[PDB]
Design a protein around this nucleic acid. Structure first.
Ligand SMILES: [Zn+2]
Lengths: 67, 101, 213, 136, 25
RNA sequence: GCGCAAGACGGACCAGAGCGAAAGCAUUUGCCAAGAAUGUUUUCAUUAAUCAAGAACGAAAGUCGGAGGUUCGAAGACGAUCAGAUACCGUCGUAGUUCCGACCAUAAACGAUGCCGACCGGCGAUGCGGCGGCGUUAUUCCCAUGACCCGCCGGGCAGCUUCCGGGAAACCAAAGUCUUUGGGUUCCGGGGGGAGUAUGGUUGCAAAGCUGAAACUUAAAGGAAUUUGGCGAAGGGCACCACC
């Protein structure tokens, strides 16, 4: 590795439909606090709401559909 | 029985046409029979365009696009969800599918 | 194992005097040790630069190939090697429901510079046209190719490399072809897609000195 | 490596070649002429599984590594040259190419002209496989 | 069986029969 | 990244477009020969249509003899898959694939619809030739021409609709004008299997082509279409006797 990634912190803006094979994950549209203009899509696991603060171990990977 | 007015192709006054190859497969398919899809794609799709535009040397830089024409065999086109089966009355409709944007 | 990039030298490349921005960029090469000379590895190099990065406020879909031919120290003096168009513009200009015309020549300038010009010409749908076809008969295509041949031969044979490359910075050949091929079929998209190099004369350093002003 | 140029006004220009296929990705960086390379990494040396040679994450790791090497070596601006496997095989580029483009963008490198250099033939040679292709 | 490979089989049988008759001189 | 050598092919333009009797035909230019359609107040005046015998051409594969062999790749050598895998998949690879010269005359060579001629609905387009007409353009005036716009004629590849009419129906402007049965003419089929088989002839260097039975056996083999049938077919929904 030889390069640690800072743990980015993000807050959701809108939740999309449920994805995954058995419906165990959902699509979210999330934004950062250190850069409010930046938004990125991600797959989260578990029950989520609108406005909760959520943690990211990386801010470069995208989301995915059921496969 | 006869299924279509034509024979699943567009050969009306030739008898022989040039055969082409499929993209996913390598099947030799005639040119007027294969399903074609001329897709115009861009280099950066939906989120990396701002990533390029903010971190760039030239301001007001237009993003280039990729142009490619795809040749599909019939089984490969149905398997890749390009075309589907239609009803006996809707088979005779030659319009392209509608587009929203 | 020693570090291989600590024995490099950063050089410069200089555009000829018929452009505006003389500075292009920097290259790198190993130093001079042994029988191999560092100036030799700077001889056979082709630099590919866009037109917007070389002139000031002109089009960006044209590229010019530049080859270094002589070196005097800490900079490489370049020379013309060819002109080419971008792939995305070439794919965007080609569309269905219009016919396609190509033409090419084997032209020679006033010195030992055998070029091979390539150009295209595309038919135009009229403003009040209802028909979707907008094709052309074969003899109209033959006359358009003859006019393109005459214009390409007439514009380069009386000039040397400097004047024709100065004409290649705009598309004045394209405007002349589009003006000429109007009483046959109206064309709208004429460009010079590619220019190659076939013959190189004996290396004279003096002409390279007037090419840099 | 180091140059006497100012690190404030002007920027150093190189090109980078992204040769990506359906099995493996290449992130190669050369100079402006292209004859003298700088540093080459592939997604095959970022993950110890060849199945993931075409993954976006391997291309992202390779792009971060080559961007760090070019940053510490003296390169700050790059021209993108995208490429598929070319020939008669396919014309769609690999699935880690734009991921490597985005990872090159995040590492603090300037991006200039973007073009594609896929070697498209004029009906050169028949493809590998039979008349019925590969039946799978 | 389908008609093509049946016709090939009967061609092979006819070739063997012709060879046996021409060697039964 | 820069150069060289060899062979093959001619993308995107490329279309329910064109030509040819069919098989077929796509880089530019030059040479030769042929042809449909349009135009005609030209010329001969019945020279016509279909055709046993006979003759030309005829995809790919195949055989004999050369030069040449880039890639793909029958047979073969392997590595996985599998109970087996001499198959699907991946790495090599021989004849062949390419040109010349001599052969065979076979394809789902299919519009699965012989050729000539007449009649019987409408519509918008398309390729060629000709005719007429407001206007725009090759920069501002006039004429002929090219490019558009609006119509008409003749031939051709095709399309949409139809209680004309036909058919067992799918469908067909021909597959219509057929019990209200006859315009001319060639080839061809009498339930299925045996069987394109045996023998004879004939053609070919060969592989094989053309002609082509019978004994015996069977009550079915088939064509068109509608609902429950199952799809390792597709598109929408549901279930803790399903899952997360
Ligand atoms: Zn396929």
């Amino acid at each position: 590795t030889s390069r640690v990634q800072p743990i980015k912190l993000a807050r959701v803006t809108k939740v999309l439909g449920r994805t995954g094979s058995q419906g165990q994950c959902t699509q979210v549209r999330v934004e950062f606090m250190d850069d409010t203009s930046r938004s990125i899509i991600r797959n989260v696991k578990g029950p989520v709401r609108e406005g909760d603060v959520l943690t990211l171990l990386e801010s470069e990977r995208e989301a995915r559909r059921l496969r | 029985t006869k299924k279509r007015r034509n024979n699943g192709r567009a050969k009306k006054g030739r008898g022989h046409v040039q055969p082409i190859r499929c993209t996913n497969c390598a099947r030799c398919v005639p040119k007027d029979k294969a399903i074609k899809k001329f897709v115009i794609r861009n280099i950066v799709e939906a989120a990396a365009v701002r990533d390029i535009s903010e971190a760039s040397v030239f301001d007001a830089y237009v993003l280039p696009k990729l142009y490619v024409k795809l040749h599909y065999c019939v089984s490969c086109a149905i398997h890749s969800k390009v075309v589907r089966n239609r009803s006996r009355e809707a088979r005779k409709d030659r319009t392209p599918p509608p587009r929203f944007r | 194992v020693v570090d291989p990039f600590s024995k490099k030298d950063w050089y410069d490349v200089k555009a000829p005097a018929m452009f505006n921005i003389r500075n292009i960029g920097k290259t790198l090469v190993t130093r001079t040790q042994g029988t191999k000379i560092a100036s030799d590895g700077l001889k056979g190099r082709v630099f590919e630069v866009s037109l917007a990065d070389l002139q000031n406020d002109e089009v960006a879909f044209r590229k010019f190939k530049l080859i270094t031919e002589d070196v005097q120290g800490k900079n490489c003096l370049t020379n013309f090697h060819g002109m080419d168009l971008t792939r995305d513009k070439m794919c965007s200009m080609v569309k269905k429901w219009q016919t396609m015309i190509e033409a090419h020549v084997d032209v020679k300038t006033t010195d030992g510079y055998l070029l091979r010009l390539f150009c295209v010409g595309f038919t135009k749908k009229r403003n009040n046209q209802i028909r979707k076809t907008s094709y052309a008969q074969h003899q109209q295509v033959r006359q358009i190719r003859k006019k393109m041949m005459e214009i390409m031969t007439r514009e380069v044979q009386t000039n040397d490399l400097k004047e024709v490359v100065n004409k290649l910075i705009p598309d004045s050949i394209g405007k002349d072809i589009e003006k000429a091929c109007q009483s046959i079929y109206p064309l709208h998209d004429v460009f010079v897609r590619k220019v190659k190099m076939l013959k190189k004369p004996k290396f004279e350093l003096g002409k390279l000195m007037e090419l840099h002003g | 490596s180091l140059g006497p140029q100012v690190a404030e006004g002007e920027n150093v220009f190189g090109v980078c070649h992204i040769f990506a296929s359906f099995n493996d990705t290449f992130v190669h960086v050369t100079d402006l002429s292209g004859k003298e390379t700088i540093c080459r990494v592939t997604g095959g040396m970022k993950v110890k599984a060849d199945r993931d040679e075409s993954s976006p994450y391997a291309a992202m790791l390779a792009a971060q590594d080559v961007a760090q090497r070019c940053k510490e070596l003296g390169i700050t601006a790059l021209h993108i040259k995208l490429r598929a496997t070319g020939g008669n095989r396919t014309k769609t580029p690999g699935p880690g190419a734009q991921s490597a483009l985005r990872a090159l963008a995040r590492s603090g490198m300037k991006i200039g002209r973007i073009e594609d250099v896929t070697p498209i033939p004029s009906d050169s040679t028949r493809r590998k496989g039979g008349r019925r292709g590969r039946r799978l | 069986m389908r008609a093509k490979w049946r016709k090939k089989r009967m061609r092979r049988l006819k070739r063997k029969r012709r060879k046996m008759r021409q060697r039964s001189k």
